[PDB]
Amino acid sequence: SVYDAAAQLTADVKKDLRDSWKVIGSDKKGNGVALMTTLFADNQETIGYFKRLGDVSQGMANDKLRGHSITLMYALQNFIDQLDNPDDLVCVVERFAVNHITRKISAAEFGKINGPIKKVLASKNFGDKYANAWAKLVAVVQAAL
Amino acid sequence: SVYDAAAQLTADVKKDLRDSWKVIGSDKKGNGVALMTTLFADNQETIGYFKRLGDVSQGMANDKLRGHSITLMYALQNFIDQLDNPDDLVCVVERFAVNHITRKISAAEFGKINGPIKKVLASKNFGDKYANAWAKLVAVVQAAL
Ligand code: HEM
Ligand code: HEM
């Protein structure tokens, strides 16, 4: 369950999540667009899911893609600020999951975000240990999908 | 249009937004549920829109409502963080608009939020000048509906 998944994020994982977010979160426009573009480059099959965003090849130039990327970063910001209270983390994760469930995104597909996140972290000198801490947070959301 | 609305956000207006958000933004969960509950009390005509949240009268105890309130606060967070770049502000307000547009929320409906905001601010010692500042931020979203 979502609680089980969340309830496991240990004090060390919370620390790595926060430390890394201090950096990749300080520049939401840049990193967020980086996440999306990388996701499209490595998993072309997901481009169709974003038809409403227009031409995603435009990158930073596409306002729809830019506004979406910035907003996505605030969803993560929200998850990070609720790390100390499982109760709050869970209920916010639940609301969030609804959007991707109606979007027909399965747990396995949503998991594809791991690759990109890993690459954005690396570009900032945050190795495997950190990528793993993020896969745990991503796992909490997967438990609600 | 939206851009003309964004221009209304002058140095003073943006300054008042930041100064107040610094206080009401430190307790997203607290102030978030206050806005929501103040709305349902001053405008029972809108409760129908939040059928999915269940018994909103419950307040903080309602998990679905609490998660929604918190998330709502991050949306505003996103707007305040884009006050320097109207371009960024506009693209995010647009993505945001698409959410309520699909919920059949008209600009007239959205404007009803000004009342609650004004009351939450006042409970934190923020007067009309401040409520007038947020009124303009809200108008940007309205021009996008
Ligand atoms: C780190 C994980 C992710 C986060 C935080 C996230 C965040 C978001 C947010 C906040 C929205 C809606 C924003 C708005 O409407 O203003 C959204 C929508 C959506 N997401 Fe994600 N997402 C994530 C991963 C994914 C993945 C992996 C996929 C695809 C394989 C995906 C597919 C979608 C789709 C189809 C929409 C609808 C976009 C539209 O048509 O406007 N998301 N996401
Ligand atoms: C301060 C202004 C407002 C902000 C920043 C705001 C923010 C939000 C956010 C972030 C969501 C949830 C996004 C998601 O999870 O998909 C949302 C959903 C919604 N909003 Fe607003 N909103 C505002 C005012 C209003 C007003 C005035 C109404 C009603 C007259 C309204 C009606 C709705 C409805 C019906 C939903 C969907 C609820 C659900 O099914 O979970 N909003 N809003």
Query: What domains are there in chain B, each with its CATH number?
Result: 1-145 (1.10.490.10)
| Ligand 2, pocket residues at CB < 6 Å | A 95, 99; B 46, 49-50, 52, 68, 71-72, 75-76, 99-100, 103, 105, 109-110, 112-113
Ligand 2, closest atom to CA B141?
A: 2
Q: Which stretches of chain B are DSSP H helices?
A: 2-7, 11-24, 28-42, 63-80, 86-101, 107-110, 114-122, 128-142
| Phi, psi (degrees; rounded to nearest 5) at B58 | -65, -35
Asked if A71 lies within 8 A of B95 by C-beta distance, the reply is yes
Q: Are B47 and A50 in contact (CB under 8 A)?
A: no
CA atoms within 13 A on the CB side of B67: 23
Q: How far apart are CA B6 and CA B117, in angstroms?
A: 19
Does any ligand 1 atom lie closer than 6 A to the CB of residue A107? no
- Does A100 show up as a binding residue in the annotation? yes
Give this entry's resolution in angstroms. 2.5
Q: How far apart are CA A19 and CA A3, in angstroms?
A: 23
DSSP per-residue string spanning B118-138:
HHHHHTTT--HHHHHHHHHHH
Q: How far apart are CA B56 and CA A107, in angstroms?
A: 30
Q: How far apart are CA B49 and CA B59, in angstroms?
A: 16
The residue of A73, A78, A99, A101 whose CB has the most chain B CBs within 10 angstroms, and thus the best one to mutate to test that interface, is A78
